[PDB]
Chain length 76, copies 2
Amino acid sequence: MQIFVKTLTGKTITLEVEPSDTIENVKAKIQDKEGIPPDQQRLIFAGKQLEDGRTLSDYNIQKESTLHLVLRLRGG
Amino acid sequence: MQIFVKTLTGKTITLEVEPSDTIENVKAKIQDKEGIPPDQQRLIFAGKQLEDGRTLSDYNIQKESTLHLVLRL
C-alpha cells in the first residue's frame, strides 16, 4: 500500500509499505529517501508520535495516510 | 563503568561496560545474562530506541544510566 510522508521542508514523498511493517521499518525507508537516521526521526500521525515496535496497522494507518517527519533536536 | 538494564520482568540488573562499547556489544552482554539473542532485542534509553552502530558515548549514556530491554514482537 502507498502512504505519504511530509518531509522536513513540507514536501511530500510516497512510500510503498505493508500494513505489517513496523514503525522501525518505516523509519529505515525514510532514511533511504531523506538521509536522516532512524534515531533522529520522530514520526507523527493524526497528531501523535508513533512508537518503534508497533505496526502501521496497529495505528490504523491505511492506504494514502500521511505521516509527518520531524527532526529530533536533542540528538540521537 | 556500571549501567543498569531493566529486564523483561521489570527486574533491574547491572552490566559492566565501557563508553566506547557499541550497542551491538551491549546486546551481546545482555544475551549472556538474559538469553535473548541480539536480533530480538530493542534497547530503549531516555524514551528512545538505540541503534546498532553507535557507542554508549554517542548517546551520552553514563555511569548508572538505565537502559530498558524490550522483546521484539
